[PDB]
Amino acid sequence: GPDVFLFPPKPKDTLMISRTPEVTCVVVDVSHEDPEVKFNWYVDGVEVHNAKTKPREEQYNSTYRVVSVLTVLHQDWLNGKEYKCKVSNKALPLPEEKTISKAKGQPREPQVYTLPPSRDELTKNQVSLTCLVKGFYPSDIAVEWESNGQPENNYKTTPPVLDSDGSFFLYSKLTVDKSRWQQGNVFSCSVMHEALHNHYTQKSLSLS
Amino acid sequence: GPDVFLFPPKPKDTLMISRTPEVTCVVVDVSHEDPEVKFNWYVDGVEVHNAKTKPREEQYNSTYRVVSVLTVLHQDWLNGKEYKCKVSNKALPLPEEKTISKAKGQPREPQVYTLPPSRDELTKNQVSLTCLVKGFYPSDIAVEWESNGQPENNYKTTPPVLDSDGSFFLYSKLTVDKSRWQQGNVFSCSVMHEALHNHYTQKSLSLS
Numbered sequence: 363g364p365d366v367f368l369f370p371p372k373p374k375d376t377l378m379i380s381r382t383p384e385v386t387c388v389v390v391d392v393s394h395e396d397p398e399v400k401f402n403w404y405v406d407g408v409e410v411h412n413a414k415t416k417p418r419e420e421q422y423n424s425t426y427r428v429v430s431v432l433t434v435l436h437q438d439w440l441n442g443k444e445y446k447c448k449v450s451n452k453a454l455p456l457p458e459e460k461t462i463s464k465a466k467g468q469p470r471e472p473q474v475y476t477l478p479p480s481r482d483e484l485t486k487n488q489v490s491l492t493c494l495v496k497g498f499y500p501s502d503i504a505v506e507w508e509s510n511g512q513p514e515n516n517y518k519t520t521p522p523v524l525d526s527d528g529s530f531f532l533y534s535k536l537t538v539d540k541s542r543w544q545q546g547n548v549f550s551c552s553v554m555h556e557a558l559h560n561h562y563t564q565k566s567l568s569l570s
Numbered sequence: 571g572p573d574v575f576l577f578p579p580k581p582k583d584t585l586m587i588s589r590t591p592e593v594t595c596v597v598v599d600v601s602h603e604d605p606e607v608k609f610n611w612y613v614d615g616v617e618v619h620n621a622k623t624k625p626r627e628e629q630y631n632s633t634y635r636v637v638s639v640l641t642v643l644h645q646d647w648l649n650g651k652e653y654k655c656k657v658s659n660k661a662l663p664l665p666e667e668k669t670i671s672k673a674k675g676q677p678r679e680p681q682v683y684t685l686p687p688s689r690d691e692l693t694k695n696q697v698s699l700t701c702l703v704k705g706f707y708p709s710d711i712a713v714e715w716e717s718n719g720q721p722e723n724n725y726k727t728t729p730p731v732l733d734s735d736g737s738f739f740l741y742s743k744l745t746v747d748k749s750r751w752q753q754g755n756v757f758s759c760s761v762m763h764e765a766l767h768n769h770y771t772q773k774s775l776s777l778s
């Protein structure tokens with residue numbers, strides 16, 4: 363059996379016009395004996411023809427991998443259009459179809475709160491700065507940390523978790539040396555989501 | 571044919587001497603034709619016999635589900651012993667063997683910090699009590715919230731996330747009416763982990 367995988371565009375990608383959001387159809391386990399593969403793309407059930415399909419690449423397991431990439435308009439993804447990738451291979455009894463879209467439901471504005479390091483933590487050589495984001499739908503989101511216009515490296519963000527109200531929440535942890543916090547440097551948690559205005563918000567953290 | 575899945579005990583069960591830690595061999599996509607499977611259970615290769623098979627359950631797509639559950643000694647699991655679940659079926663040309671074990675490595679103690687709700691969030695009907703657990707290894711953990719010795723229902727815990735140092739972290743969020751927070755009631759975050767003394771620690775959060 364040939365296998366088909368459909369990947370949605372990155373959240374940052376749909377959110378910013380500068381970026382180019384893409385939907386990607388991936389076909390794996392295409393046999394040597396029947397390597398011909400054809401991709402049909404549908405948007406809201408209507409065929410589209412602007413996809414770019416890369417030349418098939420042979421994997422080390424003697425099976426072929428074929429990828430087709432469709433550029434999507436930012437407003438189209440945000441407006442809930444459905445993307446269908448249809449794959450035909452002779453060695454396939456019926457053509458395989460996958461559909462992807464932004465999750466259904468009404469978008470909700472993310473509330474972004476910054477949390478200072480617990481008192482007990484200040485003992486360590488490193489502190490945890492917390493960016494709490496809650497109440498957002500859908501779950502597609504991006505979170506970033508910076509200081510002095512400068513992007514921090516040492517941060518980690520939890521995956522979105524379904525809250526009790528049907529909305530989503532997450533936490534982002536930024537780890538900085540204790541001295542920096544103590545020095546009064548200001549730290550910024552930045553969030554990108556569709557339900558934000560300009561698709562962006564920022565909140566700042568600093569020792570008081 | 572049918573594909574197996576093997577599952578580890580819940581973290582709380584292994585930690586608390588009272589509870590029963592279990593390992594679950596789950597078999598799916600068994601068809602009506604030959605719905606008979608056999609389970610050999612092995613610990614560190616050695617055959618033990620105290621496992622038992624559940625009532626078969628028919629599924630929605632003409633498929634079944636035959637689960638066998640072994641019980642495990644708390645120290646056997648925590649000490650790294652390996653459990654093999656071999657599923658012998660007719661539609662399966664040969665048996666499938668799958669193994670599971672605790673994650674290997676020096677267990678690390680979780681640091682438990684409670685964070686008060688943000689000042690900005692305070693102009694809200696309900697507020698967020700944040701418990702941060704970091705530096706723990708391995709990932710298996712249990713988190714709970716309490717007030718006045720009574721469980722608090724309204725909380726969600728993020729899945730463990732791998733941090734830079736190879737330890738894991740998580741956040742647990744408890745939601746309470748702003749009124750309670752103001753009244754000064756104490757709320758406690760409960761963490762259970764192997765590296766903790768008595769497999770348990772408690773941290774308290776109060777308005778102050």
Ligand SMILES: *[C@@H]1O[C@H](CO)[C@@H](O[C@@H]2O[C@H](CO)[C@@H](O[C@@H]3O[C@H](CO[C@H]4O[C@H](CO)[C@@H](O)[C@H](O)[C@@H]4O[C@@H]4O[C@H](CO)[C@@H](O[C@@H]5O[C@H](CO)[C@H](O)[C@H](O)[C@H]5O)[C@H](O)[C@H]4NC(C)=O)[C@@H](O)[C@H](O[C@H]4O[C@H](CO)[C@@H](O)[C@H](O)[C@@H]4O[C@@H]4O[C@H](CO)[C@@H](O)[C@H](O)[C@H]4NC(C)=O)[C@@H]3O)[C@H](O)[C@H]2NC(C)=O)[C@H](O)[C@H]1NC(C)=O
Pocket residue numbers: 365366367369370371372375382383384385386388390391421422423424425427
């Ligand atoms: C022969 O050798 C072949 C070469 O290795 C081998 O091919 C592999 O086959 C695997 C199957 O056997 C296949 O596994 C699947 O992997 C899925 C995820 O793949 C991504 O992440 C991997 C890392 O873990 C990468 O290695 C993959 O390449 C792939 O990477 C993603 O690629 C996309 C597009 O290229 C990219 O998006 C684009 O990125 C750019 C950035 O430049 C832009 O941002 C664009 O805007 C953006 O579109 C992603 O960024 C990139 N991601 C990453 C992390 O890099 C995985 O999802 C599959 O799991 C599903 O199916 C299994 C069933 O098999 C289920 O058990 C599982 O639960 C998943 O099911 C899904 O569940 C979802 C719910 O959570 C649900 O929503 C879905 O609907 C549901 N889907 C289905 C179908 O049920 C699966 O594991 C692997 O990717 C193949 N390797 C490659 C390189 O393609 C072949 O198998 C070998 N054959 C033999 C016989 O040996």
